[PDB]
Copies of this chain bind each other. A is one copy, B any other.
Amino acid sequence: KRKVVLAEQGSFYIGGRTVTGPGKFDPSKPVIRYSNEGATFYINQMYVNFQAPVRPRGLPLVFWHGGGLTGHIWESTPDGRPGFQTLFVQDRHTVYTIDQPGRGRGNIPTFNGPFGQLEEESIVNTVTGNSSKEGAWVRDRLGPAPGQFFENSQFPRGYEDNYFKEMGFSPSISSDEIVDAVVKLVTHIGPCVLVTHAASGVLGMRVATHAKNVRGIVAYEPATSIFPKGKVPEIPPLADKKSQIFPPFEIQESYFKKLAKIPIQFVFGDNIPKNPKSAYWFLDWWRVTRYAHSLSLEAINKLGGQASLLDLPTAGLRGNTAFPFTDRNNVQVASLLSDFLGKHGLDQN
């Protein structure tokens, strides 16, 4: 269960750019306190960790955390059980886990001055946003309200502190620069599979349209849908009749068509309502967001694709949250991912 044999492991930085302050650096002058004068800063680089089994079988997997998270979520569950990193090294895949730019060991671009500001340039906004425990509780469908759990819960109850401690803010790095870093990683790795989550769902779809080395996508509970430009289908408002889901991302149809060349699976957990739910905003948000994703997958399929929606309850798994890969049944979730990889030969050399 817990044992793991690695041919090699390591980590590295990839992607990013540099920005500079004014003037010249004088090594005779006091270097502390730190100044922007004569300064070169590396910004928006990404952290990558890799673990390779002895004699891997099939393509490397790239696990890409959701919004406000880090590669921790693939390492261990909140109660300390093995994460997908261990499970899939054991399943003989090389496993990459990333901390995207702006998260965890990824770069947070700030300097000497107000957060995110390099002299007169605003690299990222000084004003931040961040979810609360309460917001995240309902966003991840632990239960309909903070403190409550759905009946069928696979959440590791008792480990709420561990769970919410893994979450944090993201600075306003452009999504283009996040996608760019992962495109560079995919170039470095070669043919691979992207395994995405929540906020990284739409970013992974974008990466695949720029990087033919992406041979497959599995997206756990993706947060933003994607459509060809000008072809977003009618999507209803939420039951409060005022709110909307996240504005779907629109890409040129020439790029969207690249999504029809690779197997794509979206995975949803449990307790997404079938009918409008005006008393529970994020439950209703998930209902309409999942609907929008079903239309996105249909558009990919109308273009020759191999896109599918897996609702874990239809596969016999009840009670999953929006983090199925750290829930109590995450070994059974992993088995369904192994099934997808096997079906498309992504577990074969």
Given contacts A28-B240, A105-B99, A126-B126, contact A10 B145 (CB under 8 A): no
From B13, B21, B78, A132 is in contact (CB under 8 Å) with B21
Given contacts A70-B105, A126-B126, A161-B42, contact A9 B86 (CB under 8 A): yes
10 contacts between A and B (CB under 8 A): A3-B5, A12-B162, A16-B165, A18-B133, A30-B242, A33-B129, A36-B132, A107-B168, A113-B128, A114-B128
Interface string of A143-155 (1 = CB under 8 A from B): 0111000000000
Q: Contact between A10 and B111 (Cβ–Cβ < 8 Å)?
A: no
Q: How many residues of A contact B (CB 8 A)?
A: 89
A210 on the B face (CB < 8 A): no
Q: Contact between B108 and A169 (Cβ–Cβ < 8 Å)?
A: yes
Enumerate chain B residues within 8 angstroms of A177, measured Cβ to Cβ.
Answer: none
Q: Contact between A166 and B13 (Cβ–Cβ < 8 Å)?
A: yes
In the bound assembly, the distance between CA atoms of A200 and B170 in angstroms comes to 26
Q: Contact between B282 and A132 (Cβ–Cβ < 8 Å)?
A: no
In the bound assembly, the distance between CA atoms of A240 and B114 in angstroms comes to 30
Which 5 A-B residue pairings sit nearest by Cβ, starting from the closest?
Answer: A39-B132, A115-B115, A13-B165, A10-B76, A2-B8
Interface string of A9-27 (1 = CB under 8 A from B): 1111100101001000101
> In residues 153-186 of chain A, which contact B (Cβ within 8 Å)?
161-162, 164-169
A47 on the B face (CB < 8 A): yes
Interface string of A201-245 (1 = CB under 8 A from B): 000000000000000000000000000000000000000101100
In the bound assembly, the distance between CA atoms of A161 and B99 in angstroms comes to 18
Q: Contact between B135 and A165 (Cβ–Cβ < 8 Å)?
A: no
A279 on the B face (CB < 8 A): yes
Given contacts A10-B80, A105-B72, contact A132 B169 (CB under 8 A): no
A303 on the B face (CB < 8 A): no
**Chain A residues close to B by CB (< 8 Å):** 2-13, 16, 18, 21, 25, 27-36, 38-42, 45, 47, 49, 54, 70-72, 75-76, 78, 80, 82-83, 86, 99, 104-105, 107-108, 110-116, 126-135, 138-139, 144-146, 161-162, 164-169, 240, 242-243, 278-282, 285
Report A147 CB to chain B, min CB distance, Å. Answer: 10
Given contacts A36-B132, A105-B105, A110-B130, contact A3 B54 (CB under 8 A): yes
Given contacts A82-B10, A161-B42, contact A29 B132 (CB under 8 A): no
In the bound assembly, the distance between CA atoms of A8 and B5 in angstroms comes to 10
